[PDB]
């Protein structure tokens, strides 16, 4: 078949939906906020590429009279992964990022601002801009993992080294439940998801999304706002989606997908019954890439769900989308409690010894040549589109770790290279769980390829779509085609 744009909306539809959505959440009046004499501030964007429900943007605006929005294309983002040195950012996510930047500049311009784009390290670019424009502060969202917090440290020290006079203000964001509202400090986050969930749902409230004014200007006088970099300048060979889902970067496209899934298609009311699907855009929200880049936020999604429940229907599916967003919150907070044990072979559980790093075995998994259609189709979906269904990710993870016996980080780093929605907290969090090195032993499980195939792809419709040489075969053969109609198997399945 062809490439399915996600969202499937036309460029005009995306623009009108974005306008209506921005309109719906616009700040009624800026009456009560005085900006006179507050000076210049720099807003440093990272993975919060949106205008809507952006607390850093709001705080920057309300504490200044002029804002200089900046995005730094950090050279380290295009180097290599930590342990196995795969590309740090694969071509597909890189392409999605560029679309996100183009859209952010466009949306900032609509509110009277613009986005200064520079290529280089934030700790070198920001202190320089702060001095040049006499900014009193640099606002940004707080991140949680080692690499990102190290950059925060370098930027903070860079600003001090040019004087006091300039402060880095990090704002908590990204989560549906706010860190400050939790019924426990993250150091004491429950190691069992169910307990974390029951606690926040019983003792916490979700904050309303932050309303942003329609007028946010002016910016300082800038001679060159910068071109959006090209992947080629960054040393990445562009790659386009040849088949399947083609996700469209940017906040505009993101709110367009929320509109598309919830309202236009009215699929939210059946979400829970379909979320284990693997084929097509319809089986789940597909919000992950926009959430990862911060093109959309969970507080916004929650308010849309509330409106849906009021106007259309409230049931187990409308609630389940929130259940899943809580999983995202959980791994984000867990990243703080775990620190770098999140990336260590033994994981947070600080487990065992073992594991092979057999390059040949790994490559067969990576290149979709394991000989098992269920596995191969998923790995091909990933390298072709930068996305994989949640069901598929759990399965390929179990296969790599349990059937192939490989160092789980090889799989985690490959996902890091390929996923449009790559998020360290969620990626490594879910990998530690699947690998059995997280701190909830009740989640340690082996996925039977035959059973999974039977339960989630009975007609072999999914593997057939991705592995066209199986399309002619009847089911039964689709999943056990044999070595001639398909290919040899690289390893026996660990469980009979
Ligand atoms: C090995 C492995 C690696 C993963 N890597 C990532 C990753 O790098 N980034 C990422 O965002 N998700 C990751 N996931 C979680 C989950 O598979 C994806 O969020 C989901 O497939 C994204 O598609 P969706 O938006 O249609 O999902 P939906 O089912 O529509 O869920 C809605 C939202 O809930 C959140 N969510 C749902 N399930 C999970 C989960 N298990 N953990 C965390 N958040 C969840 C996401 O933000 C998602 O967009 C991983 C899962 C596994 C098993
Ligand atoms: N977005 C993102 N953020 C990250 O921080 C991150 C990724 N992705 N991808 C995976 C890598 C690997 N992660 C790691 C892994 C190990 C240490 C580590 O062992 N640190 C030592 C101290 C420094 C040293 O001696 O190496 C430690 O004792 O914790 C740090 C970060 C950070 N990683």
Swiss-Prot record:
- What is one cellular component GO term in this UniProt entry? chloroplast
Q: What is the effect of changing residue 148 to A?
A: Loss of binding of the MTHF cofactor
Tell me the ranges covered by the Photolyase/cryptochrome alpha/beta domain, including all copies.
39-176
The UniProt entry, under InterPro entries, shows: Cry_DASH, Crypto/Photolyase_FAD-like_sf, Crypto/Photolyase_N_sf, Cryptochr/Photolyase_FAD-bd, Cryptochrome/DNA_photolyase_1, DNA_photolyase_N, Rossmann-like_a/b/a_fold
Q: Does the keyword Transit peptide apply?
A: yes
Which SUPFAM superfamilies does this entry report, sorted A to Z?
A: Cryptochrome/photolyase FAD-binding domain, Cryptochrome/photolyase, N-terminal domain
Which cysteines does the record link by disulfide bonds? none
Q: Which cofactor does it need?
A: FAD; (6R)-5,10-methylene-5,6,7,8-tetrahydrofolate
Q: Which UniProt keywords apply?
A: ATP-binding, Chloroplast, Chromophore, DNA-binding, FAD, Flavoprotein, Mitochondrion, Nucleotide-binding, Photoreceptor protein, Plastid, Receptor, Sensory transduction, Transit peptide
Q: Which GO terms describe its biological process?
A: photoreactive repair
Q: Does the keyword Transit peptide apply?
A: yes
Q: Which residues bind FAD?
A: 271, 284-288, 421, 423
Job description of the protein: May have a photoreceptor function. Binds ss- and ds-DNA in a sequence non-specific manner. Has a photolyase activity specific for cyclobutane pyrimidine dimers in ssDNA.
In its miscellaneous comment, the UniProt entry states: 5,10-methenyltetrahydrofolate (MTHF) acts as a functional antenna for the photoreduction of FAD.
Sequence similarity: Belongs to the DNA photolyase class-1 family.
What is this protein's name? Cryptochrome DASH, chloroplastic/mitochondrial
């Amino acid at each position: 078949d062809h490439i399915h744009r996600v969202p499937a909306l036309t460029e005009e539809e995306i623009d009108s939906v974005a306008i209506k959505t921005f309109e719906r959440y616009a700040l009624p009046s800026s009456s009560s906020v005085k900006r006179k004499g507050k000076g210049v501030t720099i807003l440093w964007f990272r993975n919060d590429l949106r205008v809507l429900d952006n607390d850093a943007l709001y705080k920057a605006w309300s504490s200044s009279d002029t804002i200089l929005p900046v995005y730094c294309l950090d050279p380290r983002l295009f180097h290599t992964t930590h342990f196995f040195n795969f590309p740090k950012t694969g071509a597909l996510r890189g392409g999605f990022l560029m679309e996100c930047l183009v859209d952010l500049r466009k949306n900032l311009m609509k509110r009277g601002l613009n986005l200064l784009i520079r290529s280089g390290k934030p700790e070198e670019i920001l202190p320089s801009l702060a001095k040049d424009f006499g900014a009193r502060t640099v606002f940004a969202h707080k991140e949680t993992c080692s690499e990102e917090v190290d950059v925060e440290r370098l930027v903070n020290q860079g600003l001090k080294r040019v004087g006091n006079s300039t402060k880095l203000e990090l704002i908590w964001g990204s989560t549906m439940y706010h860190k400050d509202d939790l019924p426990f400090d993250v150091f004491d986050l429950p190691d069992v998801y169910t307990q974390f969930r029951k606690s926040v749902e019983a003792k916490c409230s979700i904050r309303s999304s932050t309303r942003i004014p329609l007028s946010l200007g002016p910016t300082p006088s800038v001679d060159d706002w910068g071109d959006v970099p090209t992947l080629e300048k960054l040393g990445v060979e562009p790659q386009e989606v040849t088949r399947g889902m083609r996700f469209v970067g940017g906040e505009s496209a993101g709110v367009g997908r929320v509109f598309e899934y919830f309202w236009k298609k009215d699929l939210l009311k059946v979400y829970k019954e379909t979320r284990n699907g693997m084929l097509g855009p319809d089986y789940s929200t597909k919000f992950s890439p926009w959430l990862a880049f911060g093109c959309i936020s969970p507080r916004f999604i929650y308010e849309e769900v509330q409106r849906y429940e009021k106007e259309r229907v409230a049931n187990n599916s409308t609630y389940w989308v929130l259940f899943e967003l809580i999983w995202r919150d959980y791994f984000r907070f867990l990243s703080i409690k775990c620190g770098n044990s999140l990336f260590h072979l033994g994981g947070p559980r600080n487990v065992q010894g073992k594991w092979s790093q057999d390059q040949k075995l790994f490559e067969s998994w990576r290149d979709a040549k394991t000989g098992y259609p269920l596995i191969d189709a998923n790995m091909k979906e990933l390298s072709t589109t930068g996305f994989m269904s949640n069901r598929g990710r759990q399965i390929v993870c179990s296969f790599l770790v349990r059937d192939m016996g490989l160092d789980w980080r090889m799989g985690a780093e490959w996902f890091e290279t390929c996923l449009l929605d790559y998020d360290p907290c969620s990626n490594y969090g879910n990998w530690t769980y699947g690998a059995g090195v997280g701190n909830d032993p009740r989640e340690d499980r082996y996925f039977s390829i035959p059973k999974q195939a039977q339960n989630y792809d009975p007609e072999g419709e999914y593997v057939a779509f991705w592995l066209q040489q199986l399309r002619r075969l009847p089911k039964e053969k689709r999943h056990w085609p044999g070595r001639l109609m398909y290919m040899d198997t690289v390893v026996p399945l660990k469980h009979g």
